[PDB]
């Protein structure tokens, strides 16, 4: 009736302490934000479950 409440740091995953990478990530908009909401939503359900 549950699974692990995982979480991912988008910036850490994509850009391993790279400024140039970060600039080249920001150019893609809300990519990280969207992923964060999705993962949060799952964890919320895990609690209800």
């Amino acid at each position: 009736v549950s699974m692990a409440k995982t979480s991912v740091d988008c910036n850490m995953y994509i850009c391993g302490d790279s400024t140039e990478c970060a600039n080249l990530l920001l150019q893609y908009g809300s990519f990280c934000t969207q992923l964060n909401r999705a993962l949060s939503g799952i964890a919320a359900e895990q609690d209800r479950n």
Partner: protein, 49 residues
């Protein structure tokens, strides 16, 4: 009106959710990290001369 998104934790949330009014609850607004201090550089003891 206006919000200075760097003033305080409240400001971050308001800007994050794109609203001047928040209903209630706990929200993740960003990641965080600790900033490194000095430098540590190490080179081999004895070389050929």
């Amino acid at each position: 009106d206006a919000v200075d998104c760097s003033q305080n934790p409240l400001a971050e949330l308001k800007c994050s959710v794109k609203s001047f009014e928040i209903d209630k609850g706990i929200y993740q607004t960003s990641n965080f990290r600790v900033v490194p201090s000095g430098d540590v550089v190490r080179f081999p003891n004895i070389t050929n001369l």
